[PDB]
Write a protein that binds this ligand. Structure first.
Ligand SMILES: Nc1ncnc2c1ncn2[C@@H]1O[C@H](COP(=O)(O)OP(=O)(O)OP(=O)(O)O)[C@@H](O)[C@H]1O
Ligand SMILES: [Mg+2]
Lengths: 110, 52, 48, 55, 102, 102, 154, 51, 153, 67, 160, 145, 46, 48, 480, 114
């Protein structure tokens, strides 16, 4: 859980980094966001997360929660095929390299 | 409205914290609201003294 | 109205063209000009 | 812990920084001896002693 | 005399209804609420003078009050009290002032 | 009664006196200018004069680091103890809760 | 930070299915948006979650649409597809939050709770001042000081 | 903080008045009250729940 | 009364009482002596005597509408929004002066607390038998509190 | 030279005249000061230009709506 | 209006540290003072655990007294002034009057005759004006006179 | 339109949670085009703890009336059960209902948009009352074997 | 319940039976109706 | 003004006697200079 | 759509390079076809309908720029503000977003005042009338106004015009700092080493050019110096010597350096000096530190029987007033003692405190918003508590508020922090501006907060209504 | 009147002194006790007629010295402080020549041994 004092400390840290010219942390954060923040492709027809069978005589809530927990534990972010990842994808919303970021504005002249 | 009544003329003085009564003389009722939300206790009746 | 706000049109008629159109229009008309009207015209001419 | 906190209160030069911002180790963690270097020390205390969790 | 109102005395008694001597859950689920109510009305009389005749006629209405109704008589009367310096004088403070020890 | 009052100190009344006595011994002014009249540090409470006592703590830390106990047994009120409990509300007479006694 | 107790992790479905109580709570949403803004990256996943969730809470009260009944099942398949797509978008937002929170804590030298991982300098997982004398996941003892993930001087 | 409460006598004052402690002692004479000497000055708390 | 509803009838009473309020009159009664809480407290509040003037943009807009564009900005009260018929302009259309010290009410928390606790405590501190002429003012007062099981009884 | 302290355009001059007329009338809130009235007219014409550009951009945005 | 929580959460099933749910006494609720009411570790109901920490009434009373202490400390932080007795003749005109006791009469005003509508129980006077009366025998003015700023003066704020 | 002729203040009443929330709204037009909304003597933002999702629905009656909030001064008086912070959706709904009723009383023709948008409609839902038979006291039974 | 299967949600009464029909859903945006009608008339005239 | 004060001010004993004559105001009355007549009021509840 | 036809214009300044990829902000910021005669042959190119405010030096700012926006380059910020910025002023400029400032009416007045300070000697009489005989200006107003932003712009003006300026962006680190240590050579005085070490380092690099030409007037030449280090014959070298030391030797290193720096600075009567102190109200009352208990400096042999109670009960001792600090002693000396007509103070009164009105429960440890803010609860009055001329500044007027809101929304969406592709999910600019005015009360601090909270709005039917109308009109067109 | 108001804190209200005599069961005895206590309170309040030495003092909330007066604390014994600072610096540098870190406790502050 994130607190407003954490937000203030983060603001102070980014102010210090900007004033000192250290931009490697900014570049790595932006690259991580670019890699993890792509638009999920729409699933094809018939894609549905499995549901636990229902019985009326004796519903085992422990097994009901166990199945969900195990399934989501297996569904790690590494194998999230729905979310595009890797270098083969094209992202026409984010700057691809640190060279074209505004902190490198000296290069784009004339 | 316009009801002939004889009311005591109030006297205005800063030395007196409370209202001052006076001689009862003729008056004409300009308006009188029977509504408690228009004249709460102590309710007042607006009068015009014809002497002056 | 000609110089109180900005007109929006499919063809952005220039301030020069609209002012000259109005001036030619009032010249063609035989209206007896007034001090305030001529003052407004001169004020519009003041900056261009 | 109690005397050190009281001394920090009385020394001044810190103000409310010992409570509004500072934090202290838990009650059973602050009772370990001078040199412990191990987490499981609190369970090594004698059990037949009826000192109510005071080593 | 004008008649005014007063908030009625309402008391909710909450109690079990089951007679079971084993099942506390059943006893608690069998709980019921029933409340006693006592409604009062206040009559205010403001006499510009103190007359014992009116008090005689007023205190003697509890005899012919209606069924299951009681009455209380609050009396606020002006009374002349005497303050004298003979027994309550205004003297100086004692030479040795009393302290918290007294 | 808690909290206990720590023993007094001579030059902790003001920063001028503290600097004069404990810091340099060369401070010209002995203490802050004291008005000739009496100053009540704890304005709402009338404390016994000549008695060393504290004032409500300005800092938060001392409030929870002082020797202030907590409620352990049942809470007793000087008058409400006649009424057994909030659930067992003992009412002698069925009078109104807004009733007045003139 | 202030929460150093070992915690139990709920499934992402359990987190998402909660309405505007914790997952979609405006206070937490605006805190996350402020964190993203201060870091300088776009809030596309958070906004994509918010646009879905505000409409969901707007229409939560009304009844489902009347339907004749699709013989081919295309309508049911489409509804399931939309629900899954929205759920996956919210999954991406949840993962983004739980990743950038750890990254920000690592940058700010904030010690997290028990048995959690910060990609910077703590990959095994952080355990400190826990009720058990071991990591409870590696079954290895820990020193009496919790750990020193960061240097001393600020 | 810890302090000793002073008491400036009206005679010693440049112009005499009636001290609050003197008036409180007069009040205790009037109505038989109890002055709790051991009552701390830092425990004056208002019951905010009912006040 | 067909003028106002229950709550409006109740609140106009407080408005009139504050309009005719005089602090020297409270020496006799108890809770009745306390004036309208909101108005009295917002009058005691010292931060409300500084009423801001109309803001610059609104002044300029009203000027360019009334003078340059020959069409003043009508207040919402006087706007004929009834397409069916013309409604008469109410007497309170724009002549009700706006002041921060009278409305809306804004008061200090300590003042509010003191007012509330004083009003609660001063319950029986009313001199019922006075020499004032009228309903109030008598030599003796009798209160018959009659109690039964049923409200209609 | 920097910039001349004079109403640059027709709107500037007309609103300057209007502000002077309001100052003569003595309406409440009128700054009745030369520099304050200049700030007033400059800010108001800036607001008018901002409104004009917002109205220009909204119609272009309406063409880009998905449905 | 305060954003703090004045109510102790009711006793229910064991609260586990997770999202939307934290342990009832996890050193964060009501400050760190919940350690007085914290009983860590699994505890046998049969022969372990102090009942006063399990009694909802007592813990509510304790959290009430802690909140009262917070309110008192903040009020005394606000109370920067101190009260000094003056024998009714060296006070200003606004004080040469009868002041009813606290919570006994209508909240008085500080002489509304000259458009002064402050609260007499809250008005605070500075030491500079009362320096002469407070220190009659001081001689040389130990506190310098308060240098008032002239509002009619032509300063940078008045658009020089 | 019903309003006091002397002060021009319209009084509206709003309720939520049955009896937990009751508010009275006093509405008056400001000729200066300066409009502030106050709840129990404090600014609306401070009362609602600067919560946009709560303060938006207080403005919503003005938007549905196609009016300007700066032209009106609104005061809110809380009745029933008083709490330190009422920054909750139920209290915000009660404030919205009170403001809508006050605006309807002030201006008659404003009633149609608000009624068609459901501003004036009252919901009778309220929290289930306490019952000691339930384990928590409200909605959960006791353990069964 | 008492060792019995939990009934389906259809058997339970309406969860929002105590709210007016105009609330679910709200029809806010009445001020835009006249503007959109006038816009429609203008574009139809064009 | 002195005439008005003389004809409008009543002494304590005079007021007590005047009220006791016609209004039957019960209670003792004092004429000695060291005594003062306070026209207070008493309130009590009787129930049978 | 006008997406592929658009190419980025050549980048002239840092502001022009803060443009997000075109595809992301195409929906948010529409494009229009602009026609102009480029070298005879007319050319029609697509361009943005919005552009960032121009970046220009303070000397280029004029009267016409009042109530407008202007940007400052990243390199300019680095070279001008090494001490940092105000407490809540930097949160509106993340690294991607361009750094902008509102040229307020008070900003123009202070810009002129700093311009006079550049050569005050020719206009001593002019400046004396402006200050009305006081030693500077103190700015006060409601919480969340632009008072800290005014100080940041003042420091920008002073450093752009090359005037030696002493900047204290945060008074909390001094008055309410971490720990306080008694002065090494000044009896009866204290200091905060944590703030002093950072202050000296930032001040030196801020005024490296000016302080290099400075020469010591009153400074010992035999100060302690480690092997390899050189005796400072220059003021800047003295500043470096103040903080270039390893702890704990740096504690006394800064303690003597700060006093000598103030004494040398007060011994200057020709070169103009500008002092900017944010939150001066913290420098006029007691600090949160407490005087040490007398038992701590007495020595105890046996704690069990020593007639002491430091370890028994915590107690309250009088707080150290801010005037007892070595750093503040120099400022107080300049303000009070005359014969110093070149020191110009520009100070702010922070009012960021924990809210308190009657009752005050325990704040939630997670949702608390004022947890980091210091708490004093002491009413303040700059007129009576400061020697500087008071300046009352209020919240934004709608002219400034509109410009501020326009900059925030559009530049953020252009930089790539707004809705972007989700532009249709937010209300139009006028609707947003109208709502923010009601929500924030036209408060500068409230504007940014409600701008962030804009996405969480639930009751805004404009976009749904507009989509419905467009769909109906499209269906009618298809039928026709 | 002021002395009487001070003597009776809550017994007076809105200018109406009120005493609820509850001591005895019999109202006849209770009214006697009430009159006795009222006369006693009035007699003790009448001390203000004797002289100024019995006039109750006025509770005046004087402010802490304002910031302008506070700022003078930095110039207390300013010349003496400046004179002492040079000697303190001499001692500081002499001790620094031998010790890496020098504390004020050995320069100017005195901490007695025992
Ligand atoms: N001229 C301006 N240019 C840019 N931003 C501004 C300007 N004026 C005010 N702001 C913004 O207003 C907000 C608050 O400003 P500021 O930091 O000055 O507040 P404050 O009143 O000093 O607050 P506090 O009480 O916390 O000290 C910030 O987000 C800041 O960026
Ligand atoms: Mg600030």
């Amino acid at each position: 859980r994130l607190t407003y004092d954490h937000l203030d400390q983060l603001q102070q840290w980014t102010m210090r980094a900007t004033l000192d010219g250290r931009t490697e942390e900014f570049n790595r954060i932006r690259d991580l966001h670019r890699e993890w923040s792509q638009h999920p492709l729409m699933p094809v027809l018939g894609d549905v997360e499995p549901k636990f069978p229902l019985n009326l005589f004796k519903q085992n809530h422990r097994a009901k929660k166990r199945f969900l927990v195990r399934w989501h534990k297996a569904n790690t972010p590494a194998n999230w095929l729905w979310m595009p990842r890797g270098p083969t994808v094209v992202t026409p919303l984010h700057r691809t390299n640190p060279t074209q970021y505004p902190e490198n504005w000296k290069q784009m002249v004339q | 409205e316009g009801l002939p009544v004889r009311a005591r003329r109030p006297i205005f003085s800063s030395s007196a914290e409370q209202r001052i009564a006076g001689g009862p003389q003729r008056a004409v009722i300009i308006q009188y609201h029977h509504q408690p939300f228009f004249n709460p206790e102590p309710r007042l009746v607006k009068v015009a003294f014809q002497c002056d | 109205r000609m110089v109180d706000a900005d007109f929006d049109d499919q063809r952005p008629v220039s301030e020069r063209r609209l002012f000259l159109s109005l001036l030619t229009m009032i010249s063609y008309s035989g209206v007896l000009y007034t001090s305030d009207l001529m003052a407004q015209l001169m004020e519009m001419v003041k900056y261009s | 812990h109690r005397p050190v906190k009281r001394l920090f209160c009385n020394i001044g030069l810190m103000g409310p920084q010992i409570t509004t911002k500072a934090r202290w180790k838990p009650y059973r963690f602050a009772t370990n001896p001078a040199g412990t270097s191990k987490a499981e020390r609190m369970y090594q205390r004698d059990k037949t002693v009826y000192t109510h969790g005071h080593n | 005399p004008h008649v005014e109102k007063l908030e009625p005395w309402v008391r909710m008694a909450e109690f079990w209804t089951s007679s079971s001597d084993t099942s506390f859950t059943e006893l608690e689920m069998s709980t019921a609420h029933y409340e006693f109510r006592k409604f009062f009305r206040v009559i205010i009389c403001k006499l510009p003078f103190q007359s014992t005749e009116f008090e005689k006629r007023m205190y003697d209405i509890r005899h012919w009050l209606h069924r299951q109704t009681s009455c209380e008589f609050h009396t606020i009367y002006r009374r002349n009290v005497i303050h004298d310096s003979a027994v309550f004088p205004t003297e100086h403070d004692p030479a040795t002032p009393t302290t918290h020890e007294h | 009664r808690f909290p206990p009052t720590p023993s007094e100190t001579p030059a902790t009344q003001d920063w001028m006196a503290y600097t004069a006595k404990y810091l340099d011994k060369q401070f010209t002014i002995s203490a802050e200018p004291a008005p000739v009249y009496n100053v009540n540090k704890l304005w709402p409470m009338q404390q016994i004069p000549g008695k060393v006592d504290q004032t409500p703590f300005e800092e938060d830390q001392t409030w929870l680091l002082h020797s202030i106990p907590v409620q352990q047994l049942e809470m007793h009120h000087h008058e409400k103890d006649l009424q057994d409990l909030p659930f067992i509300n003992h009412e002698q007479f069925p009078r109104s809760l807004e009733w007045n006694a003139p | 930070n202030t929460f150093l107790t070992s915690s139990v992790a709920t499934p992402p479905i359990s987190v998402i299915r909660t309405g505007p109580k914790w997952w979609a709570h405006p206070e937490r949403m605006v805190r996350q948006k402020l964190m993203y803004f201060t870091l300088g990256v776009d809030q596309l996943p958070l906004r994509r979650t918010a646009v879905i969730q505000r409409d969901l809470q707007r229409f939560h009260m009304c009844k489902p649409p009347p339907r004749v009944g699709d013989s081919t099942g295309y309508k049911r398949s489409r509804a399931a597809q939309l629900n899954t797509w929205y759920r996956r978008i919210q999954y991406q937002e949840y993962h983004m939050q739980h990743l950038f929170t750890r990254h920000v804590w690592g940058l700010l030298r904030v010690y997290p709770g028990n048995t959690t991982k910060i990609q910077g300098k703590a990959d095994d997982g952080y355990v400190g001042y826990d009720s058990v004398p071991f990591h409870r996941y590696n079954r290895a003892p820990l020193p009496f000081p919790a750990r020193e993930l960061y240097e001393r001087r600020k | 903080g810890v302090h000793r409460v002073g008491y400036t006598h009206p005679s010693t004052l440049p112009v005499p008045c009636a001290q609050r402690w003197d008036l409180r002692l007069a009040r205790a004479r009037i109505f038989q009250e109890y002055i709790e000497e051991k009552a701390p000055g830092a425990w004056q708390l208002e019951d905010e729940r009912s006040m | 009364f067909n003028e106002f509803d229950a709550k409006g009838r109740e609140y106009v009473q407080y408005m009139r009482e504050f309009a005719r309020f005089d602090p020297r009159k409270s020496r006799g009664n108890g809770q009745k002596g306390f004036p309208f809480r909101d108005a009295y407290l917002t009058k005691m509040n010292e931060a409300n005597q500084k009423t801001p003037p109309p803001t610059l943009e609104t002044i300029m807009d009203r000027a360019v509408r009334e003078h340059h564009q020959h069409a003043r900005i009508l207040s919402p009260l006087e706007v004929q929004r009834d397409v069916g018929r013309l409604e008469p302009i109410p007497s309170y259309a724009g002549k009700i002066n706006a002041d921060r010290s009278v409305f809306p009410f804004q008061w200090k928390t300590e003042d509010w607390y003191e007012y509330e606790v004083a009003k609660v405590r001063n319950r029986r501190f009313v001199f019922e038998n006075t020499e004032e002429d009228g309903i109030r003012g008598s030599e003796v007062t009798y209160k018959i509190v009659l109690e039964g099981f049923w409200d209609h009884h | 030279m920097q910039k001349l302290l004079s109403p640059r355009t027709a709107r500037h001059a007309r609103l300057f005249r209007l502000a002077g007329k309001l100052a003569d009338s003595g309406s409440p809130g009128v700054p009745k000061s030369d520099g304050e009235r200049l700030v007033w007219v400059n800010s108001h014409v800036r607001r008018d230009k901002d409104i004009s550009l917002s109205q220009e951009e909204e119609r272009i945005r309406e063409l880009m709506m998905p449905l | 209006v305060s954003t703090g929580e004045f109510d102790h959460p009711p006793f229910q099933f064991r609260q586990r540290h997770t999202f939307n749910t934290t342990p009832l006494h996890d050193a964060n609720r009501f400050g760190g003072r919940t350690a007085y009411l914290r009983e860590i570790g699994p505890v046998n109901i049969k022969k372990q655990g102090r009942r006063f920490k399990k009694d909802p009434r007592t813990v509510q009373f304790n959290v009430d007294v802690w909140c009262a202490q917070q309110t008192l400390r903040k009020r005394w932080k606000q109370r920067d002034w101190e009260v000094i007795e003056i024998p009714f003749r060296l006070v200003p005109r606004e004080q040469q009057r009868v002041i009813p006791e606290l919570y006994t009469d209508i909240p008085q005003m500080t002489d509304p005759a000259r458009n002064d509508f402050s609260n007499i129980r809250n008005k605070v006077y500075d030491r500079e004006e009362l320096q002469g009366v407070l220190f009659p025998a001081a001689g040389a003015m130990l506190y310098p006179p308060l240098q008032r700023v002239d509002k009619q003066a032509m300063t940078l704020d008045k658009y020089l | 339109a019903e309003v006091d002729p002397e002060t021009g203040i319209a009084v509206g009443r709003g309720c939520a949670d049955g009896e937990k929330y009751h508010f009275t709204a006093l509405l008056r037009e400001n000729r200066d085009h300066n409009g502030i909304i106050t709840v129990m003597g404090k600014p609306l933002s401070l009362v609602l703890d600067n919560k946009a999702w709560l303060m938006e629905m207080v403005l919503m009656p003005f938007d549905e009336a196609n009016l300007d909030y700066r032209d009106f001064d609104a005061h809110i008086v809380s009745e029933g059960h008083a709490m330190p912070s009422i920054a909750n959706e139920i209290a915000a709904f009660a404030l919205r209902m009170a403001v809508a009723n006050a605006l309807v009383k002030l201006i008659p023709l404003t009633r149609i948009p608000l009624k068609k948008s459901g501003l004036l409609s009252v919901d009778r839902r309220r929290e289930r009352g306490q019952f000691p038979g339930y384990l928590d006291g409200k909605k959960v039974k006791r353990r069964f074997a | 319940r008492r060792g019995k299967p939990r009934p389906r949600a259809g058997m339970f009464p309406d969860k929002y039976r105590r709210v007016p029909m105009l609330l679910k859903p709200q029809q806010g945006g009445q001020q835009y109706f006249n503007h959109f009608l006038i816009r429609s008339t203008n574009d139809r005239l064009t | 003004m002195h005439i008005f004060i003389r004809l409008s001010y009543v002494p304590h004993a005079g007021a007590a006697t005047i009220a006791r004559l016609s209004r039957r105001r019960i209670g003792p009355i004092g004429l000695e200079p060291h005594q003062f007549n306070v026209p207070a009021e008493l309130g009590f509840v009787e129930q049978y | 759509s006008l997406a592929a036809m658009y190419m980025r214009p050549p980048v002239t300044c840092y502001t022009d390079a803060c443009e997000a990829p075109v595809a992301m902000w195409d929906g948010a910021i529409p494009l229009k076809e602009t026609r102009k005669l480029k070298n005879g042959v007319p050319v029609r190119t697509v361009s943005r309908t919005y552009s960032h405010p121009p970046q220009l030096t303070p000397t280029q700012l004029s009267f016409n720029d009042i109530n407008s926006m202007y940007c400052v380059g990243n390199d300019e910020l680095i070279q001008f503000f090494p001490e940092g910025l105000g407490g809540r002023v930097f949160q509106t400029m993340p690294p991607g977003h361009p750094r902008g400032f509102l040229y307020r009416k008070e900003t123009h007045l202070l810009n002129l005042f700093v311009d006079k300070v550049q050569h005050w000697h020719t206009k001593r009489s002019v400046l004396s009338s402006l200050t009305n005989g006081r030693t500077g200006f103190i700015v006060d107003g409601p919480t969340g106004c632009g008072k800290s932003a005014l100080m940041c712009q003042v420091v920008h003006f002073a450093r752009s015009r090359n005037i030696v300026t002493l900047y204290v962006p945060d008074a909390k680190v001094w008055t309410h700092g971490e720990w306080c240590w008694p002065s090494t050579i000044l009896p009866g005085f204290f200091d905060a080493p944590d703030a002093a070490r950072s202050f000296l380092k930032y001040f030196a690099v801020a005024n490296r050019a000016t302080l290099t030409s400075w020469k010591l007037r009153c400074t010992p030449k035999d100060l302690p110096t480690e092997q390899g280090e050189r005796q400072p014959q220059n003021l800047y070298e003295l500043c470096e010597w103040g903080h270039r030391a390893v702890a704990p030797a740096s504690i006394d290193r800064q303690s003597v350096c700060v006093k000598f720096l103030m004494d040398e600075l007060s011994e200057e009567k020709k070169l103009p000096v500008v002092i900017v102190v944010d939150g001066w109200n913290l420098f006029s009352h007691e600090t949160h530190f407490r005087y040490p208990h007398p038992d701590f400096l007495r020595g105890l042999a046996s704690f069990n029987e020593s007639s002491t109670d430091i370890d028994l009960y915590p107690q309250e001792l009088p707080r150290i007033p801010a005037s007892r600090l070595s750093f503040v002693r120099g400022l107080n000396k300049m303000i009070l003692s005359g014969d110093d007509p070149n020191k110009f103070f520009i100070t702010c009164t922070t009012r960021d405190f924990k809210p308190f009105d009657g009752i005050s429960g325990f704040p939630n440890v997670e949702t608390d918003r004022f947890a980091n803010s210091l708490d004093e609860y002491a009413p303040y009055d700059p007129e009576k508590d400061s020697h500087f001329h008071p300046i009352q500044i209020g919240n934004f007027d709608e002219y400034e508020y509109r410009s501020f809101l326009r900059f925030l929304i559009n530049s953020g969406e252009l930089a790539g922090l707004g809705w972007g592709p989700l532009w249709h999910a937010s209300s139009d600019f006028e609707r947003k501006l109208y709502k923010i005015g009601f929500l924030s009360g036209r408060n500068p601090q409230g504007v940014v907060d409600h701008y962030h909270q804009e996405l969480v709005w639930r009751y805004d039917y404009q976009r749904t209504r507009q989509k419905q109308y467009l769909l109906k009109r499209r269906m009618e067109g298809m039928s026709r | 009147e002021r002395r009487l108001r001070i003597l009776a804190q809550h017994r007076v209200g809105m200018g109406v002194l009120k005493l609820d005599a509850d001591k005895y069961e019999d109202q006849a005895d209770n009214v006697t006790f009430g009159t006795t206590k009222l006369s006693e309170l009035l007699a003790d309040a009448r001390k203000a007629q004797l002289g100024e030495e019995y006039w109750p003092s006025v509770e005046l909330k004087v402010r802490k010295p304002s910031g302008q007066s506070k700022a003078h604390y930095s110039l207390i014994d300013n010349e003496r402080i400046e004179k002492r600072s040079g000697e303190l610096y001499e001692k500081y540098r002499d001790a620094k020549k031998r010790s890496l870190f020098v504390t004020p406790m050995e320069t100017w502050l005195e901490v007695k041994g025992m």
